[PDB]
Design a protein around this ligand. Sequence first.
Ligand SMILES: *[C@@H]1O[C@H](CO)[C@@H](O[C@@H]2O[C@H](CO)[C@@H](O[C@@H]3O[C@H](CO)[C@@H](O)[C@H](O[C@H]4O[C@H](CO)[C@@H](O)[C@H](O)[C@@H]4O)[C@@H]3O)[C@H](O)[C@H]2NC(C)=O)[C@H](O)[C@H]1NC(C)=O
Ligand SMILES: *[C@@H]1O[C@H](CO)[C@@H](O[C@@H]2O[C@H](CO)[C@@H](O[C@@H]3O[C@H](CO)[C@@H](O)[C@H](O)[C@@H]3O)[C@H](O)[C@H]2NC(C)=O)[C@H](O)[C@H]1NC(C)=O
Ligand SMILES: *[C@@H]1O[C@H](CO)[C@@H](O[C@@H]2O[C@H](CO)[C@@H](O[C@@H]3O[C@H](CO)[C@@H](O)[C@H](O)[C@@H]3O)[C@H](O)[C@H]2NC(C)=O)[C@H](O)[C@H]1NC(C)=O
Ligand SMILES: *[C@@H]1O[C@H](CO)[C@@H](O[C@@H]2O[C@H](CO)[C@@H](O)[C@H](O)[C@H]2NC(C)=O)[C@H](O)[C@H]1NC(C)=O
Ligand SMILES: *[C@@H]1O[C@H](CO)[C@@H](O[C@@H]2O[C@H](CO)[C@@H](O)[C@H](O)[C@H]2NC(C)=O)[C@H](O)[C@H]1NC(C)=O
Ligand SMILES: *[C@@H]1O[C@H](CO)[C@@H](O[C@@H]2O[C@H](CO)[C@@H](O)[C@H](O)[C@H]2NC(C)=O)[C@H](O)[C@H]1NC(C)=O
Ligand SMILES: *[C@@H]1O[C@H](CO)[C@@H](O)[C@H](O)[C@H]1NC(C)=O
Ligand SMILES: *[C@@H]1O[C@H](CO)[C@@H](O)[C@H](O)[C@H]1NC(C)=O
Ligand SMILES: *[C@@H]1O[C@H](CO)[C@@H](O)[C@H](O)[C@H]1NC(C)=O
Ligand SMILES: *[C@@H]1O[C@H](CO)[C@@H](O)[C@H](O)[C@H]1NC(C)=O
Ligand SMILES: *[C@@H]1O[C@H](CO)[C@@H](O)[C@H](O)[C@H]1NC(C)=O
Ligand SMILES: *[C@@H]1O[C@H](CO)[C@@H](O)[C@H](O)[C@H]1NC(C)=O
Ligand SMILES: *[C@@H]1O[C@H](CO)[C@@H](O)[C@H](O)[C@H]1NC(C)=O
Lengths: 183, 411, 137, 49
Amino acid sequence: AQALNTLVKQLSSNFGAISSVLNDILSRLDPPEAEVQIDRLITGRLQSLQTYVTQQLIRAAEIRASANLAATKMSECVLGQSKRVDFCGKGYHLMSFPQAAPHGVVFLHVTYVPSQERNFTTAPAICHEGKAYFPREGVFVFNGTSWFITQRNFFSPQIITTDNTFVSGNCDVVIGIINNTVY
Amino acid sequence: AIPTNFSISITTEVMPVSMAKTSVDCNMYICGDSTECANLLLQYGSFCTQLNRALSGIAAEQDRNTREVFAQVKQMYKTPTLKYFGGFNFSQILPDPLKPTKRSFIEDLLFNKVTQYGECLLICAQKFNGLTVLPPLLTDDMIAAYTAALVSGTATAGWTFGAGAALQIPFAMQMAYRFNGIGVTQNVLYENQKQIANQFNKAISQIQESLTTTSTALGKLQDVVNQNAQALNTLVKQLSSNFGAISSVLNDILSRLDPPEAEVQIDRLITGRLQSLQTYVTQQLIRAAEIRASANLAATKMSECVLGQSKRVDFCGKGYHLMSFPQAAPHGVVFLHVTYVPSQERNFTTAPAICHEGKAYFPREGVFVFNGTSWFITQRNFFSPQIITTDNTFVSGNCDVVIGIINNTVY
Amino acid sequence: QQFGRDVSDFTDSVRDPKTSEILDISPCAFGGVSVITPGTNASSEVAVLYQDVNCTDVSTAIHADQLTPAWRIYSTGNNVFQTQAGCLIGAEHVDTSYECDIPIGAGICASYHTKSIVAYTMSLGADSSIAYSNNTI
Amino acid sequence: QQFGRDVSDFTDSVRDPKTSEILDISPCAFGGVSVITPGTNASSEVAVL
Ligand SMILES: *[C@@H]1O[C@H](CO)[C@@H](O[C@@H]2O[C@H](CO)[C@@H](O[C@@H]3O[C@H](CO)[C@@H](O)[C@H](O[C@H]4O[C@H](CO)[C@@H](O)[C@H](O)[C@@H]4O)[C@@H]3O)[C@H](O)[C@H]2NC(C)=O)[C@H](O)[C@H]1NC(C)=O
Ligand SMILES: *[C@@H]1O[C@H](CO)[C@@H](O[C@@H]2O[C@H](CO)[C@@H](O[C@@H]3O[C@H](CO)[C@@H](O)[C@H](O)[C@@H]3O)[C@H](O)[C@H]2NC(C)=O)[C@H](O)[C@H]1NC(C)=O
Ligand SMILES: *[C@@H]1O[C@H](CO)[C@@H](O[C@@H]2O[C@H](CO)[C@@H](O[C@@H]3O[C@H](CO)[C@@H](O)[C@H](O)[C@@H]3O)[C@H](O)[C@H]2NC(C)=O)[C@H](O)[C@H]1NC(C)=O
Ligand SMILES: *[C@@H]1O[C@H](CO)[C@@H](O[C@@H]2O[C@H](CO)[C@@H](O)[C@H](O)[C@H]2NC(C)=O)[C@H](O)[C@H]1NC(C)=O
Ligand SMILES: *[C@@H]1O[C@H](CO)[C@@H](O[C@@H]2O[C@H](CO)[C@@H](O)[C@H](O)[C@H]2NC(C)=O)[C@H](O)[C@H]1NC(C)=O
Ligand SMILES: *[C@@H]1O[C@H](CO)[C@@H](O[C@@H]2O[C@H](CO)[C@@H](O)[C@H](O)[C@H]2NC(C)=O)[C@H](O)[C@H]1NC(C)=O
Ligand SMILES: *[C@@H]1O[C@H](CO)[C@@H](O)[C@H](O)[C@H]1NC(C)=O
Ligand SMILES: *[C@@H]1O[C@H](CO)[C@@H](O)[C@H](O)[C@H]1NC(C)=O
Ligand SMILES: *[C@@H]1O[C@H](CO)[C@@H](O)[C@H](O)[C@H]1NC(C)=O
Ligand SMILES: *[C@@H]1O[C@H](CO)[C@@H](O)[C@H](O)[C@H]1NC(C)=O
Ligand SMILES: *[C@@H]1O[C@H](CO)[C@@H](O)[C@H](O)[C@H]1NC(C)=O
Ligand SMILES: *[C@@H]1O[C@H](CO)[C@@H](O)[C@H](O)[C@H]1NC(C)=O
Ligand SMILES: *[C@@H]1O[C@H](CO)[C@@H](O)[C@H](O)[C@H]1NC(C)=O
């Protein structure tokens, strides 16, 4: 809008010519004299006109930044699930609902947010009968009662069995090997 | 060809995210403090209304680019006391509190290889030219504070800091999960945790001596300063253009010549300088659209590369990235790259499946590598002889649907 | 040598034609004006910022009526504080920190607390610490 | 009052100087033309807009 009110308000400028209405330049001045004062009004009205094009032309490429964002952030986020860092909301994105906006779009990203944390004491390795044992996925979790396995988003116990234990290598080499009983 | 022995080194990535915001008063650029210029100026129209809407619209966007890159952090985490994390020497990267700098050892050398218009730096002085360079929103101490809370907090919380609340984790537990990203086992970290840490301690020592000795690795940040210098001086030297007048001096044309000789040549030098002012305003407006690009390569390589770990090839580190280190710098960001570069491969014989019981046996991961002696399963990022068992391989179809099955037994 | 010039091409130093005393010529002070308001629904008071200027000359020229523009009903209230952005005149300096609401520059923001318009240094965020505990998650 | 203006400086409506009726002014017509063609290969008729 304020690009156009730049443009409309430059009609009423005199541009250093005799007047800002052509039926007041042609009226008073005689046609040898008037047509040189019309030329400074035409050139004044063209150089604000071509500048309006260039200000529209740069602000057009400001949107192709944001239109190739929204072409991706719809065709990677609604049409899939985004596995990126704070792309599509903050947290772990699950769905996305795009809406339609005047001269733009509206997204509705739904994220997964972890909560309600609690410490424990950890361990990277178990010494079970001469070997060092390693986690397949998770860490060695000791809540004061027993040693078990959980995942890094939800606290839920897993019995340390050689199903879900990365069995490799000898004991007493790795930093932090804790004498437990793997079942 | 599968490796067994890799390297960790550090690669510097350098980006600018902001340039120097300026502003221009017309009545001392255009008129040069003459009265009749301003009388002639108000007859052109209020065009300096719009020419300080533009250089405010850029100057308000150099605040966002400095703020959208660095101020991703919710909580300013303190610098921890011990800076030695299982052999990982974070001394040169977090700032040393003994200095009166609030800067790390890296950042001090960055300022000393990078190192006309009014400014108020305190001594405030004006110029005859109406060119001012206003100072930014975030001073360099605030910039060196978001840097320090991105390496303090990530040394104690890792990817959780970008995931959610900055949950504690040992940093040796941290790097091992960052081997789990690139398909590389926990035993690659823990067994090798001495010389993993001691290449990385000397890889920082390389970047020290590479930046104490020379420069021009910061060529991008130099050129952001150079394009500031030219566009001001071209705006300076076009003051001295005659533009068809008898001189470029509005007060000689005022005082020395006739009043009919004046207004002819006042009206020349304004229309000359006015559209030389608009060319400057336009070329700042284009140059501030490349910064808005290269401050979004930094607001994604500080989202994706610093908080998470990136699954993107040759993006924030050649090879497989592990961790990223932000730094402050004059007008921009200097990244460091913990990269997984495998090395020293040998030749191995592969084959599609096992022929036992007249049935095909399909692996879940990797290949089947012949030792010269034995068949076993490994992955292609380090040599790892895991033996073919009953659950690391599964079954569908008979033999010889694969071309070149092994007469083997699933053990 | 009669006179001096700067790194630009206007003269800023002169040897005196009468008594040969080597002088400096700095131009007169000038700059932009901002206005910091909290909203007409909020209030009807404002505090103005004068950009890139020394508070010695600005606070002087207000009382001596030397500013173009000049206001009909305005006075400083004796609140002049120098930032690197310029002489913020009309707001109350406060020694605490908060989050930024209306920016000024060089780490200074201003807002509308107990009501009046106040100015302060930014707080970068919540302060915290994380233990580096050798076996804890 | 004798004649009205719009938000620009153009007098978009006047009153009759003789019979005091207030009359709008309308910019009789203008506009662009575009040519909607199937291509000169497949046809030689057009349609203007
Ligand atoms: C805004 O303008 C005001 C005035 O126009 C200005 O305040 C002035 O600051 C200077 C220093 O910046 C002061 O000068 C000092 O005055 C003391 C006491 O009179 C002297 O002892 C000082 O001498 C020391 O410094 C000299 C130069 O650094 C050394 O050569 C010398 O050996 C001494 O170490 C020095 O002369 C001056 O008094 C004030 N004047 C007033 C009226 O306040 C202020 O700095 C300007 N601010 C900005 C941002 O431009
Ligand atoms: C696999 O790669 C690693 C590193 O790329 C190689 O480790 C290097 O081994 C040599 C020994 O051949 C080390 O040299 C020795 O270092 C000790 C340090 O205590 C020093 O006291 C000795 O006098 C000697 O200089 C070298 O330091 C070490 N590299 C690093 C970075 O520490 C390893 O040899 C490679 N393996 C193969 C099979 O190539
Ligand atoms: C972790 O890295 C830091 C580098 O920041 C190591 O600090 C360095 O330690 C050496 C050994 O003391 C210092 O060399 C000595 O410095 C003193 C200080 O004046 C000097 O008198 C001696 O002649 C010698 O040069 C070195 O300067 C120092 N580096 C810095 C920047 O201070 C630190 O030792 C590393 N950690 C471990 C456990 O090694
Ligand atoms: C620590 O976790 C274990 C599970 O891994 C919890 O153990 C169970 O607790 C329930 C309720 O007390 C008992 O009925 C079960 O018999 C326990 N199972 C085992 C194997 O011990 C334990 O309660 C947790 N610790 C605390 C303090 O809640
Ligand atoms: C966990 O078990 C290992 C088993 O190897 C322990 O290592 C033994 O340590 C004792 C003294 O600490 C020695 O007398 C034994 O000879 C070691 N075992 C072997 C097989 O040599 C280890 O000490 C245990 N952890 C802790 C904390 O005691
Ligand atoms: C892996 O195999 C390649 C080719 O199969 C080997 O490269 C050849 O090495 C011989 C010397 O032993 C040369 O004469 C050939 O010209 C090489 N050929 C090519 C294409 O490079 C390579 O040396 C082997 N490497 C290992 C570690 O086994
Ligand atoms: C976790 O431990 C830290 C220090 O070890 C302590 O400050 C914090 O209160 C603990 N939180 C919980 C939920 O146990
Ligand atoms: C593989 O071959 C090497 C040397 O040929 C030998 O030392 C090693 O024991 C073999 N491993 C297996 C699992 O056959
Ligand atoms: C494997 O055994 C089958 C069945 O005897 C035979 O057809 C095939 O040729 C053998 N593979 C090789 C490489 O000889
Ligand atoms: C002024 O602000 C209050 C704040 O709640 C709001 O309720 C009220 O609607 C606002 N006034 C108008 C006219 O909207
Ligand atoms: C961390 O644990 C390892 C092994 O338990 C030990 O060598 C090291 O000294 C410990 N560091 C601290 C700071 O407690
Ligand atoms: C002029 O006179 C006619 C009748 O002769 C009348 O209808 C009209 O209103 C008059 N207009 C003015 C402007 O007096
Ligand atoms: C021209 O039109 C004919 C059919 O009308 C079509 O087969 C041909 O490909 C067209 N060629 C071009 C250059 O348009």
